[PDB]
Subunit: 410 residues, 3 copies
Amino acid sequence: YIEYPVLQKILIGLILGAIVGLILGHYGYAHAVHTYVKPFGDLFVRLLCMLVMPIVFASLVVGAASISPARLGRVGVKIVVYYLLTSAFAVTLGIIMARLFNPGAGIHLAVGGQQFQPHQAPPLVHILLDIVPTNPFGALANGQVLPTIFFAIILGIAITYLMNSENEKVRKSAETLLDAINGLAEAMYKIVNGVMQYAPIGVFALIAYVMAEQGVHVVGELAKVTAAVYVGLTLQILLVYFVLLKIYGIDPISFIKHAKDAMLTAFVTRSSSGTLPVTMRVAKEMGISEGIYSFTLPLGATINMDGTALYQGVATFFIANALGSHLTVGQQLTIVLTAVLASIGTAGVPGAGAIMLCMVLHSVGLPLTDPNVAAAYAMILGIDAILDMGRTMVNVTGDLTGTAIVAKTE
Amino acid sequence: YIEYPVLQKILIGLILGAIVGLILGHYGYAHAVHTYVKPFGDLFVRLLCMLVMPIVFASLVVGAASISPARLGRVGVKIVVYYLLTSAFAVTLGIIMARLFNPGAGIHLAVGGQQFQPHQAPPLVHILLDIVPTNPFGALANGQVLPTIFFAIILGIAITYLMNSENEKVRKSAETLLDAINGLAEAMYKIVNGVMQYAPIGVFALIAYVMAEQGVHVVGELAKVTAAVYVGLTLQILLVYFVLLKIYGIDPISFIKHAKDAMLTAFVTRSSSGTLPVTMRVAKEMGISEGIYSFTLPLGATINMDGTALYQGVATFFIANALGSHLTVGQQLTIVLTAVLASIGTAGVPGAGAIMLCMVLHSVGLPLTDPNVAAAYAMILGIDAILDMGRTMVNVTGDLTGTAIVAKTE
Amino acid sequence: YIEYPVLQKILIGLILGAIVGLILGHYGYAHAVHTYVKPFGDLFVRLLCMLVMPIVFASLVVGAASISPARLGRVGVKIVVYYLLTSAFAVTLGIIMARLFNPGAGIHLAVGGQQFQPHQAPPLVHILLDIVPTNPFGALANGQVLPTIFFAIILGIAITYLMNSENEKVRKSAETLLDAINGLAEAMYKIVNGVMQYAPIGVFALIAYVMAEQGVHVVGELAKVTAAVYVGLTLQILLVYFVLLKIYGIDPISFIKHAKDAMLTAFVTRSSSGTLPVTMRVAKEMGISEGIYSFTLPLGATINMDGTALYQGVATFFIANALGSHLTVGQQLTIVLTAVLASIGTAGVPGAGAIMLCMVLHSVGLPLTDPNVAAAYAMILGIDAILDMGRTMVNVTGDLTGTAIVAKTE
Ligand SMILES: [Hg+2]
Ligand SMILES: [Hg+2]
Ligand SMILES: [Hg+2]
Ligand SMILES: [Tl+]
Ligand SMILES: [Tl+]
Ligand SMILES: [Tl+]
Ligand SMILES: [Tl+]
Ligand SMILES: [Tl+]
Ligand SMILES: [Tl+]
């Protein structure tokens, strides 16, 4: 009988938890929480960490397959590096937000009561090589995202080159195989949506605990995050888009007035994928060639998830300082390196950035299995339902603003 | 040149072993056995444990795919829960047999000379979550059937939902991918048959050892098992079928006289799969609609393996008490929970229930790799060639008796 | 801008390294090498060891699929065992070369400064069973080639039997699934070629180090290898081919004069695969039936890589004695057992035998991860670009000489 609009359904869990949390935050100790409540939350998270691999894998082989040079027209080539570098400065800005805002510093948690100290990172030499799977499956089997990616990529590539062969039996193999991976990719997504319906019961149990414990000083950071994001966000639109809108003689203001229908749909639908109908509709509405938006719009909804890139860029810096940890340059550049190759997986749905987070964590040697991290992420996940809104509303903006740029360039 | 009818071929190994065992049971110590003989047996078992995963996996994703709601007509819906609950009480009865018969108590073995004590089971909290793979591959890679299942299922589901999409490229992906898994599924089966031809040389080496050692007090349990089964079995037909045959105004006695051809073929062919021709033949023979038996008969031959459910239900209780172990309620209900989701894999062939056993073992934390268990299962496997006969002859009965019930209901 | 003909491109790295090595072999200690140079080499090797599994797997399931009895005409049957036994004596000869030549004895290396002593090999009993994967994935995940093979094979088989079924849905499954594996298989190959373009930068860094260290006494073995090979090689042609050419009343000398175009193309192209056009051209040129060379030539270019079989047969014996190790009979027969089931994978491309080497190593418990082995293989790999030439030129010869033999037999 649970049919309600997801977003509220969650916001229902979200606003109602806080209180039931804080009201149980004074009276019956948070331990009842800890034993009767958390058990429902984690399942959630676990239900996510579950997917991370297949979807880190499948997604990126297929990801690569779309981008694979030059199984793309010079029209893509143009738009491609738009996306890269708009996704690239996106996070550059995420750090800026996260270097002027320090949410998590002043929350620092002891977990079980023990502070966390990271395991030593191997000589820069090794770390390189370590990207090269010693053995695909053996790497794939257990964590080690650094290679998992590397590989899957090189596959995607190799694959595109197989459809371009003399032999037909061969030319074929690719198609199928590839296809099959894809869909695995897809299935994921749909479990994601299945998950994002336990998401209400979920988000409730998690945050309630984080409010039950940590007192209330928490929300101060939580809205301090929300800030760091939106304020990053809205500024991104001004600093990058409006900046490049005029740089090809397109009126930025009007552009928005057109995209006003689609964006303020993305805001509330959060599905960069299911909101394709709306997107391509506005496309022609503002005078874009069929043969141009028919290709970019179905590609940027997936890749160039510039909004995600930031989210992580920031979310990262929340987590680290919540452990009271300092992020060493080398991994500061990793965050992004990752955070980008992250958004090449995503297809732009509900949980999206959340799961990736893990991914960016795991790469930077912050194993979730570690309770410190665990209880911290746990927060960000709760609220993710919110940040997600604006995030996906910008992912979308980012896609049209490329489209119009290559339609004028075209 | 080894061409002989499998069943005899085995019974040949089976009856001839016992003697050559017991005759070597008095004279040249069983150690010669242990060093020249067992080495051939185990290979067998190993040849089985080998398959368990793929076939625990492939089978259940595809399993799910057939059942996936509502990628089935309301005609299935009806028959579905017949099967469930006839498979469900089936094992309920298996426990009854195994609580009035206690085969294994009075055989209790020391293995290397050390008794076995089970590893502590995690707090009921964890055990739940532990069903959610932390990471598919990483779980899939090594045991942990509890999740392997959970997952594969949720996949099967997700998959059916992919063929029901707007996008065609998508609608496709499912089909193929799915397909491909399926066939992996199938291949298994055919190696199974390839195995069940080493089965003669196999069953010989195993039991001979168990007769070489353990003296003879063993057969007392072995025929005490055979009992517990058949007597469960024949009674199942009376207590359930004849019970529900009349409960829709169908004459049970006649029904049998019709099914008399097909069942007494299943008894001897043991292939719930290859015996489909015979099944559907009798179907119309007793007045069943084409559009009704064309769907149930090709589905119940695979799922609703009620005979299997018991076999395990019982086999379980043999093993445990052969170690001198007591089966805690919580895992007593697991056996079944499992034993059912077991028979959703199986396609109904030779080794069938045997392999699953492992599956139900592994779930209930009884690692075969442990010699105690190892030598015990080892027995059940030998004789499985027999119990199998009646077992598959009932699996079949169970399928027609549903069919006629929904054809009258229809 | 790196476009140059691969072979030179490498020989360029190869001849130029030696010197820059030896010149840095007297002056600035080899340690600069060790810290600025090796790091580039290994990557290479790592880039290979990476592939070994998929391609050990995919290749052999599909391998099996071609050979699977009797999903082949009695025309294959004939040619099949030609290939087997020409691949079989091939290596028999490889040992002969490697028992009269002892390259590596007189190079013996201390690695870090510690000699290597192999881990004890389990009782011959276990080792057998150990071929039967305890669990496919779990084996597949981490090394254990002995089973990986065994399994994949039994699959290939099982698969062919699935396309020969009553059920169509089934008949299908096989096709796709199979296909899909295949192509994975293929992709590999193409990354191989992608690798064999870092191969110049690669082969440079590796050998330079091995010249930087070990002084120069090395080349003495390196050309002593080159010897052991070519001299094995050219003799193989005389001892086997010319021997069996006349044994069916075909003139060996002429045969060569015909194959003179194709072989001396294989020598320089090293691609048993891309050189199929040339092969089948000469086929009719020397009077071979369309319906005969259309089947053997596209099968022997892949299987019956008799040249490979030797390479390893020998390469093995280089490595072992470079560690100062003695190769126990039981594993001496393994080398081959392997080395053959090796060449059933390969499709006959650039790196080919190199990677397999690993495979034959891993089986004979010589983990590359061990630096001793590591620095040694490392040599063989460098020069492999050379030996490869003759090797593939004979693989090819081996294929026509079967073809003509079954065309006369036919
Ligand atoms: Hg995660
Ligand atoms: Hg098992
Ligand atoms: Hg290797
Ligand atoms: Tl986007
Ligand atoms: Tl994406
Ligand atoms: Tl059945
Ligand atoms: Tl089944
Ligand atoms: Tl060849
Ligand atoms: Tl091959």
